[PDB]
Subunit: 656 residues, 3 copies
């Protein structure tokens, strides 16, 4: 409960919160109002929650980039400083805290990342990134490391990714507004690739975080590091002779760090909006106020003109502004949250090798399109003997880390058709079982249309089918020789020497033409007509459902390409699926132990059947559709497939 009468302030732990407390103490001694400063973990995430329920701190401190979302969600109150106060702060800092014309926070300081090197180890810091690998080889030979910085927060990695071309909602002006994100273009790739190489050649270590980097550098174990003004305080204490300079260039271009402005917003639910205003305007935003804070951990270029003129003479601050200017001021639009998450995940995954750079960024471009939700559900009504085991298994292996559930649907005697009441039961489970979302449901069930049931959000359908004949042949020898997944269990007809070709020639049951009729009914659905072997109507309904209801249908013999596309369009589920497939062993699961290729004549015989022609028309339809999707989705280079970067943006947006 936001208590009235006192003030609760939240500020990140890397900042000088102890000094901030002193300003709180001064405030108590002059007004009698107690001021408590706290520094929670995941501050930028805790606030929007604890606050969305009329609770939380009175004043929230954070870079301006996230305040936009807080504003759009009505968690921030509008600040009303009179022009007398507004005039003592730099005009461009007020812009950082302006959302929809209103001022939603008080700016405090300008933060920008700089290169921080060890004078004793590296007399002359490197001007470019390209020269850091050679340097590390020399420094390694002396028991040292060249560079070390937080590879966990995209904040520290972004300067490089953006260097040659990456961006996020470039600041534009005009009668109209524009929307264009750019994390999957050449530049961004060239940048992240360079960083991934640095890890491959062991120049850097993928899981080095803020602390390991700080400790390493502050112990003179590594010549350089990348950090903000707040880090100077601890470096001073380590008697390390350091320097704060411009960031290394990449491809002849400067590193463009996303520049942020530390800001203080007032909680819209705060019953002390006034006391909050008094503290921030008459106490914190004064020379003595900022000094108390800055003495704890440097703020950088304060927004307060009177105190900046002083701090500006600090070489380190000059280095800050130099880098700051080489880059850009972060936007404060709501989209920013999705942007950071997308980029955060891409770097981490690219750095650990879980994803290639192409796959990592293609996914981030997708993930940046909206704030990630848990509301998604995938239904994969697998068709027997189509490599469904291999696939469904990729989901099982990725589900724990990717944070989603996998569930197998088991139907009595493996009947593809559920009763009407069971359909209702199934749909109700899938749409309401919140704890299973996001979820991946798979099973031997023909398509079931969720629309008829009045659901809010339909699930996403995907599938995999293979040539009609080959799947049958596969099911044939399967029943007689088992698989290599669970080799122990002898299948129902183990030890029948009758070959497929033999069965055809002798007109056996398991090789009858009507056994080809399977993939069509699985898509056609739970309709009577669907199960009339050879129905033309069912063949049309099958194609319509495949086109209208299915997200993507791949073919057994092209499983890899299928996974690649899914990893681009549905990263929450298949992020890292390609690498897993390409190097996991569990890639070609449940192979049939013994098989015997059909006869050129045995096939030509099956191909005289109406059932075959139909099931074949269907397969072709689906295959053409997959090849089409792949073709409009990727580009080839040296036999390698790459995900085309986003090819659309919004322009002429009105009003602004």
């Amino acid at each position: 409960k936001i208590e009235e009468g006192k003030l609760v302030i939240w500020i990140n732990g890397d900042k000088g919160y102890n000094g901030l407390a002193e300003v709180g103490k001064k405030f108590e001694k002059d007004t009698g109002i107690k001021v408590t400063v706290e520094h929670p973990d995941k501050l930028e995430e805790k606030f929007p929650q604890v606050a969305a329920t009329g609770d939380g701190p009175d004043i929230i401190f954070w870079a301006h980039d996230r305040f936009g979302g807080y504003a759009q969600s009505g968690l921030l109150a509008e600040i009303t400083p009179d022009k007398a106060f507004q005039d003592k702060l730099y005009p461009f800092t007020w812009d950082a805290v302006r959302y929809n014309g209103k001022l939603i926070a008080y700016p405090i300081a300008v933060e920008a990342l700089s290169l921080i090197y060890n004078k004793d180890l590296l007399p002359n810091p490197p001007k470019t990134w390209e020269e850091i690998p050679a340097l590390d080889k020399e420094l390694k030979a002396k028991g040292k490391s060249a560079l070390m910085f937080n590879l966990q927060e995209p904040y520290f990695t972004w300067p490089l990714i953006a260097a040659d071309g990456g961006y996020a909602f470039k600041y534009e002006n005009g009668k109209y507004d524009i929307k264009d994100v750019g994390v999957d273009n050449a530049g961004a790739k060239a940048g992240l690739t360079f960083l991934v190489d640095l890890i491959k050649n062991k120049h850097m270590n993928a899981d080095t975080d803020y602390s390991i980097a700080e400790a390493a550098f502050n112990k003179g174990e590594t010549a350089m590091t990348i950090n903000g003004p707040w880090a100077w305080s601890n470096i001073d204490t380590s008697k390390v002779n350091y320097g704060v300079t411009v960031l290394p260039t990449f491809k002849g271009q400067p590193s463009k760090p996303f520049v942020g402005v530390l800001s203080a917003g007032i909680n819209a639910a705060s019953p002390n909006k006034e006391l909050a205003k008094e503290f921030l305007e008459n106490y914190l935003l004064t020379d003595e106020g900022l000094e108390a804070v800055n003495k704890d951990k440097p703020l950088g270029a304060v927004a307060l003109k009177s105190y900046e003129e002083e701090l500006a003479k600090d070489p380190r601050i000059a280095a800050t502004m130099e880098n700051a200017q080489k880059g850009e001021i972060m936007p404060n639009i709501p989209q920013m949250s999705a942007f950071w998450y997308a980029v955060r995940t891409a770097v981490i995954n690219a750095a650990s090798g879980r994803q290639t750079v192409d796959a990592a960024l293609a996914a981030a471009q997708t993930n940046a399109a909206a704030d990630e939700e848990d509301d998604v559900v995938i239904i994969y009504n697998r068709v027997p003997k189509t490599a469904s085991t291999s696939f469904t298994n990729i989901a099982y292996d990725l589900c724990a880390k990717n944070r989603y559930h996998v569930l197998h649907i088991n139907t009595t005697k493996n009947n593809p058709v559920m009763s009407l009441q069971d359909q209702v039961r199934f749909v109700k489970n899938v749409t309401s079982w919140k704890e299973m979302k996001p979820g991946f449901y798979h099973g031997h069930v023909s398509y079931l249309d969720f629309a008829k049931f009045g659901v809010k959000k339909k699930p996403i359908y995907i599938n995999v089918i293979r040539d009609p004949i080959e799947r049958l042949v596969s099911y044939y020898y399967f029943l007689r020789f088992g698989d290599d997944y669970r080799p122990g269990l002898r299948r129902r007809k183990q030890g029948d020497k009758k070959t497929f070709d033999e069965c055809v020639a002798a007109g056996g049951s398991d090789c009858a033409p009507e056994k080809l009729w399977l993939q069509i009914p699985f898509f056609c659905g739970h309709s009577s007509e669907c199960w009339n072997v050879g129905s033309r109507w069912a063949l049309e309904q099958a194609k319509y459902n495949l086109i209208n209801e299915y997200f993507l249908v791949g073919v057994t013999e092209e499983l890899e390409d299928f996974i690649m596309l899914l990893e681009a369009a549905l990263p929450r589920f298949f992020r890292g699926a390609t690498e897993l497939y390409r190097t996991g062993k569990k890639s070609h699961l449940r192979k049939t132990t013994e098989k015997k290729l059909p006869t050129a004549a045995t096939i030509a015989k099956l191909q005289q059947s109406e059932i075959w022609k139909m099931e074949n028309e269907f397969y072709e339809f689906a295959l053409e559709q997959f090849q089409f999707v792949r073709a409009h989705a990727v580009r080839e280079k040296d036999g390698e497939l790459y995900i085309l970067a986003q090819n659309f943006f919004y322009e002429k947006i009105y009003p602004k």
Copy 2:
């Protein structure tokens, strides 16, 4: 407003809340904090509401089974007892209050239902249920009754339903989790059936509740009763010589009562989470604390080891544990809420005869699939002369009790096609008119696709059609002889002696082939093409809409089977519809007063028309589809149809 400084506790009225108050008083005398204990009605339902808005009690008392949902909804705060405290309570009781690894409540006591008989009336209590009918005959002859207990709460009935096979999310373990509900299998039916028979043979009375049972037994009017430890307190006061023993077996199997653990959770919005912890750990969960409570109304087997060793010597407690062990500890997963409602409604309806046991449980299986919502809307765009009056009337008769609305859509001159603007008007009404939900809208309107209008949740469509010719013949004589619904009103052509056959032979207007074109356009929709008599495209669109958009389409001559299926798939609307149809009189409403079967030659003539062929193809398509749904939905036994029990469950769920 959850006031800070004091404590508000909620506990059910059957428990010893007065004794709990004494513990509160002790707490006030040692800390100065006032403690108010209250016992509201529908406690388990009030909490989740009053609490979902940051209000309500500080501490909520209830069996552990519902705390799971409270947890998932963030209404409960995590309890932090140190192992010093955790060790003084039985380990299995802490498991009951564990949800998602966290401890969400303090366990207090173990409750289980036992058979409570009158030593003076029934010296030797019956060992099985099967012997209770004979016993009642003997006891009735002496002015007494054999057994009486609450038939309103499924809690008391469940022991019997579960005896031979019923269950709800059986507790399993392994690398994976499982989900399987079982309230519609043989066992559950055999159990509820037995109970329904006991009411049919007047051994028990369907609307006997907790009070009638307690009063009856405590007045020695009935030899037995089923209740929990809390009931002993009032029995002691009635000078009735009673005994607490094992529950009667059914089919050689023991009654498995759902075992619950009385638990105390702390409100997540409570500003006194600490005072709450102090009260529960140092005051209530102590020998003197539980004793104060237990002296008011027995708690059962307390979770506190030190005090259990004492109470355990009580024969009654031994009987409690005996029954407890014969059964199972209730799960605490969110699904539990839906489970209880489904079972509560099935018993009540089966017991009053509103539903047969099959229909009652088939519906509960459906209703257990998700928490009931009011967001559902059914649109029944009735086709003239297809028994729509009979049907729509079943909705009108069931709507009050089943809690939903029925509304008739009236269109100027009964035009099946609404204007584009009216479609928008209609859709807006149906999707936003919250107070009419759930709702049943019916009227002479052709299919209208809600998808095109950007709605969140589409409505559910159902319909009923009949043979093309017979419906026309029906409409023919209708216009001339009226119906028996409103016999007074003479219809537009009353007193035309021209028979149907006569009209055909003379090529009259009302019997023209083009008048057969009606059921097709009604499904095809509001598209121009639909209304071009004899359009092939319209015949295809009709089938597609029937398959893709309609929940279920029955045929006039099979109205009963149609109702049976709807009562299984949509119980909120049609619960009890079968019984109503089978025995209400208002079953064959609006019959046409006088009719004259067409001529074998008059029909053969209509059947030469393209319009007939098409409309006939449609009817056949729909009929085959209904027969198919019915076939995959029911099983026959002695000419009787039964709803197949659920044939699917989830396995290999990962992670756990």
Copy 3:
């Protein structure tokens, strides 16, 4: 935070809030509880917001009409007056504050609009509206005006609109409930038309609001005005000799003002529900309480019997009741909110000429069907050279005032097919970009099915196509002579003298039959089959998507009729589009500078192509469908088209 211990009351600023304060002061002197009365702007809108979050005033004052919605949303607490109190207030006033059987507010006074004239200027006030124009001519010649009243609130205009036939949920009774709105019938039109004429003939001024009317009349500048009892207070101060009489009749019928009852409801979140009850029952609803208030600004006919008997002797109050009785008591059902907004917007737009009366009311009927939401999104995937520029431009010009966004979708090289990953990106943007809603997205993109992506709410699709050949011919000469939109930019083939006919005869590329294949794929979508020139399947999918997914598809040569329909079905977007089209100049944008009609023989040649036949079948299908929609949507009169009024309502609603 609704503070406990005091009382916060909200009342509209036109009422006597200062007098109400005096009652608050009396309450403080007898109980020590401070009472603060405030009068915010947009009170009826502020409450439901500030209150929906457990905050706001303790007591809310407003006419009973909106309290229904407040109730349905649980913002009001039930009032519990004992029959001793209930009996001292008129029974019909308690009905006004009864929602769903419960009493949700205390009634205070009955308000009704009356005609207020200047005795000195207009000795004998006009009995009918029809005689006011002549009167103004006489009064204008003397430097005066005849009538002036608030034309901004539909409250003041409604008496006239309802006079001859307009209504809103007429109060009915019976075993069943009824729902029927009537703002687009003859009467309502006849009424608003009369008012619009008064503005056309400059008898009144469209943007005259409450203040201008009050000032004008109170300065004797205008002979009459329409207002409530609250206005008498200021008129008395202006030494104007005024009289309060019956409202002028229209078409021989009396003006039926919507009668409202000023009511005081208690905030459901209020922690002082008792103090609130004490103040309202023992202080405000007493002779001395109402007198204090009434002395500030007359309340009208108080609900308190004892004090009404006094005030009832006031001629002015008699005039109030006379008008009140000629009209009806406003309903208090939730629908009322939507009703007022719809009517408020129609009057304003009709009065400014932005909409004709027909268009204004047709739209209000549509807008009254549900509370307006911002959640709507329109996607207009424009086809090249179909007048899309003219149309998309109407959106741009109307978006600022109509409060919605317009965005152009730009695809690399104008490719109609997005990649699978881009489709995901696009859909994610459109469904989650909250700040762009409502929105209008337009661009060269073929249909994209949002269903496959598991979205909550699909967007609305509209399009415009034209004859296959003429569009091609248009695209032909476009490339060679440019357009008049951006004449400067010379198009890719500027200065080719080859005519269309010439190109055909010489079998050129840009005039090839396969270039006709465009409108079909645009509707068929992102499927491979769609892009196989001449595919029969694609032609069927195109028709299905046009019928199943598109809201409305118009044809280039009938753009006006298309706009008219959209202005009726989607007023939020196209309100005023017709007038803009009919009189804006920017109506036929981007015309091709030079063209040359094809040859009767050149056409007959193209018409031999399979591609033409197909694309032609499609166009015809779409054209027939548009003509059909228009036909069932409008009526013609003197060559003029009018939107048919709503032709459906709900009857036999059960239960009541």
